[PDB]
Design a protein around this ligand. Structure first.
Ligand SMILES: CC(C)c1ncc(C(=O)NCc2ccc(F)cc2)[nH]1
Length: 149
């Protein structure tokens, strides 16, 4: 699988993260990210995808060692952590054919796992519109604890 790169953008309080909502298969909420182009550096892919999806240019704020990286079904997804971005920043996708909406969400209210269906004696997980964000939420909480406290 081709690696993806993007960003976890936080506000000035460190309470809120910026999520984007796509369409169709990408219909839920997730961190802005996308597939690396051939020969493109990870930091440049992150800035490009974030700029295409939010209108906000992270290039001056990326810190090379501040990211969370997960391998999900043998695809690497790395999100650079970008704190301190004012909540009144005007975000506007380049591509409204790809992005429905862009919103701030409270970190402490986002789920860090989906719910089972054990109330129904059924296997698996209930749908959750934060499916794509979820895997990063516990690592992000643990990373903000270590880095800030
Ligand atoms: C709901 C679930 C089926 C799902 N699968 C993939 C995604 C997804 O990535 N959504 C967020 C998103 C990121 C970037 C973008 F450009 C547009 C949308 N969501």
């Amino acid at each position: 699988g081709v690696p993806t790169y993007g960003a976890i953008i936080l506000d000035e309080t460190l309470e809120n993260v910026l999520l984007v909502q796509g369409y169709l298969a990408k219909s839920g909420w997730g961190f802005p990210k996308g597939k690396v182009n051939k020969e493109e550096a990870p930091h440049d892919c992150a800035a490009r995808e974030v700029f295409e999806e939010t209108g906000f240019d992270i290039k001056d704020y990326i810190c090379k060692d501040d990211y969370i990286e997960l391998r999900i079904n043998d695809q690497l997804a790395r999100l650079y952590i970008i704190p301190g971005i004012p909540k009144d920043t005007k975000f506007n996708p380049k591509t409204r054919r790809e992005i429905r909406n862009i919103e701030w969400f409270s970190i402490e209210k986002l789920p860090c796992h989906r719910n089972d269906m054990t109330p129904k004696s059924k296997l698996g997980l209930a749908p959750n519109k934060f499916f794509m964000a979820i895997p990063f939420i516990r690592p992000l909480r643990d990373w903000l604890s270590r880095r800030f406290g």
